[model samples]
Target: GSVQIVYKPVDLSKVTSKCGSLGNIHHKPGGGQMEVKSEKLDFKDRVQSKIGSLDNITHVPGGGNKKIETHKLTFRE
Candidate 1:
């Protein structure tokens, strides 16, 4: 195993009528593909059209699988 990296966003977003913010997420170079999993409709239907949806199965290095659970990205102005 080349080492798999999975990031779960404990907090998705927070807005206060001033600034919209998102929590920090980590990324790696060759740590397989990263996917965000969420049940929110706006995230999947609205933003997905722009950024694309997350894959259920993450193809990790050395033919491994990592199931990641994440939250929907919410933005407000």
Candidate 2:
């Protein structure tokens, strides 16, 4: 199916965590809204992209020991 593009700005609140700040990541304290540059992605799409990246984790091995590290996650179409 062909994709249809919509040009509505994004609202941070839709993807923002309700439980205060999420450390290192900066966001509005009480569900804030922000404008997105893309016209195809809406508030939810933008937020989902951010959230998906935030949930990624990677495993590393050192000295026969398993270590977990948070990788720099990013999203793009």
Candidate 3:
């Protein structure tokens, strides 16, 4: 069984608490949307890949002792 995941373009400003002006990764899941600070990720055109095949990029540490957010989504193929 294969799981389907949808990556939609999101605005960084709406979800982030800090570093909203800089490039970041923002996602919208169930409850609400949130943004993460990327130390060296150029988020421009980040999700340009088609469905089934997507880019695998990692985000740099957000500094200090902040924990990154995580989510569990269900998608059918």
Candidate 4:
């Protein structure tokens, strides 16, 4: 059963639509990644940590450069 951890499921993508800029995921977003309108800083950070460990898609703390946090959708531990 522990093997299941290699690929868990998440609704982040479905939730990603909540964002305005990323509302409609029609094209490849490169120069269009920025900001988050999360209401609660608590849960917001929870999601951030997931991305950081899940896909290595984390930002460079305090840096102007922005790295969108998108995971592998769960697979390949």
Candidate 5:
């Protein structure tokens, strides 16, 4: 099986008062794996791919309120 690299944008401003900084996310020292749960998107992905960076908004679909600050789940492997 081939490895599938799925890179989704995770925005920080979207996520409300959660963690302190987005930099907290980093690769494992062992060079194996590091899992980080955050709402900060790489932005480049969103700007380029045009993918929204919000989760669970309303019937609007991707209309997740930017005012309320919902947040996106970030995972790195």
Candidate 6:
């Protein structure tokens, strides 16, 4: 695998857009990706993400109004 690295947000009704082309995702090298925003046109809590890294998936970005955590998947084989 040469320690390939990449990331993508989860799938949920509350997430905006399903383009999956990094359109709804924001990235930080040592940080994370997909700045969470409630897909609701109105307003709400409950951001959505089912992204993964190293075959381990994680939910919940962080505190309110915070972006998702780091999700750089590095797999070397």
How well does each candidate superpose onto the true structure, as a TM-score?
A: 0.16, 0.15, 0.17, 0.15, 0.15, 0.17
Candidate 3: where is the Cα deviation over 4 Å?
Answer: 1-44, 47-63
Q: In candidate 5, what are the lDDT values of residues 1-77, reduced to their tens digit?
A: 56665666665655434333334344333333435466875665437543433343224223333565454656566
Judge candidate 1 against the unseen true structure and give its global Cα lDDT, from 0 to 1. Answer: 0.48
Worst 10 residues of 2 by lDDT: 52-61
Candidate that scores best on lDDT: 3
Ranking by lDDT: 3, 1, 6, 5, 2, 4
Model 6 clash pairs are 26-34, 32-70
Candidate 4: tens digits of C-alpha lDDT, residues 1-77: 46544566655543222222323324433544445455554554436443312232443333244346766554564
Poorest stretch of ten by lDDT in candidate 5: 56-65
Q: What is the C-alpha lDDT of each candidate?
A: 0.48, 0.43, 0.49, 0.42, 0.46, 0.47
Model 3's number of clashes is: 0
Output the better candidate (3/4) by TM-score. 3
In the range 1-77, model 6's lDDT, one tens digit per residue, is 24544566875534343332333554344655545454545435886645343333444443324346555655556
Per-residue error (Å), model 4, residue 56: 9.7
User: How many backbone clashes does every candidate have?
Assistant: 0, 0, 0, 0, 6, 2
TM-score of 2: 0.15
| Candidate 1 wrongly placed segments (more than 4 Å) | 18-77
The stretch of ten residues in a row with the least summed lDDT in candidate 6 is: 14-23
Better of 4 and 6 by lDDT: 6
Please list all clashing residue pairs in model 1, or write none if there are none: none
lDDT of candidate 6?
0.47
